[PDB]
């Protein structure tokens with residue numbers, strides 16, 4: 001049984017992607033953009049009312065297997081889209097004028113493993129040459145200063161960069177989709193936890209994007225909007241100096257493809273529960289995060 005206020009296993013999220021699409025055919029379609037290491041379908045939802053030459057926003061969740069609140073958020077976003085369409089003026093305008101590509105779980109194999117064997121697993125579940133250690137960090141596997149600072153060359157490490165950029169089937173699938181839809185995708189949003197941040201480029205080096213002032217102002221305003229609901233305090237800024245330097249991240253890669261609005265969200269909390277955020281916080285976390293996502297979306301729409 002699926003619930004938006006609980007953490008759902010992969011079988012349940014998979015079934016949900018089919019059911020939410022069949023229940024909302026005028027607003028949602030579903031495709032698979034590839035398969036994981038273990039052969040699971042990587043589902044992607046296109047959320048929006050059909051129309052001509054619509055720009056798009058791309059949002060993924062579940063890069064990191066243990067960050068269960070991320071997976072919950074992508075589901076919550078779709079929940080909001082279908083529930084409030086027609087009733088809330090902004091969400092309705094967004095869905096009428098833009099498409100949201102929502103990838104509810106990227107690292108499906110890792111997610112399954114957090115349910116079955118090890119709640120604190122992070123990486124994919126692929127093999128590595130010359131060792132029995134498993135997995136690559138998907139957020140060190142993109143072609144963005146690949147395998148330099150904040151990424152490990154050791155396959156037994158939690159930030160292992162992989163054998164090559166896009167070595168993982170999952171990251172290759174996501175990068176292929178973005179490259180194939182680059183002319184329409186205007187913003188890239190990638191949802192993680194924890195530590196309460198809105199990050200933008202760059203993480204792979206201490207450098208700033210050409211539109212730094214714009215991104216800084218946008219992130220600042222999104223954080224302020226998020227705080228209006230429950231007073232939850234987020235920090236923001238370029239990744240390298242706001243959290244830590246880390247190469248091979250998808251947000252930086254997406255930005256370097258020309259997607260000018262590229263953000264990594266780190267959701268609740270600040271470490272009390274960390275990755276094992278209780279189910280009792282799903283609602284509040286998702287609702288406040290919606291305000292930041294809607295703020296960013298509204299900005300993108302008005303600055304086409």
Ligand SMILES: NS(=O)(=O)N[C@@H](Cc1ccccc1)C(=O)O
Nearest residue numbers: 139192193194203239246249264
């Ligand atoms: N969610 S997290 O704890 O893993 N934090 C992220 C931070 C991060 C964000 C953007 C680019 C590189 C790194 C990570 O991939 O390390």
Ligand SMILES: [Zn+2]
Nearest residue numbers: 064067192193
């Ligand atoms: Zn993460």
Ligand SMILES: [Zn+2]
Nearest residue numbers: 080286287290
């Ligand atoms: Zn709501």
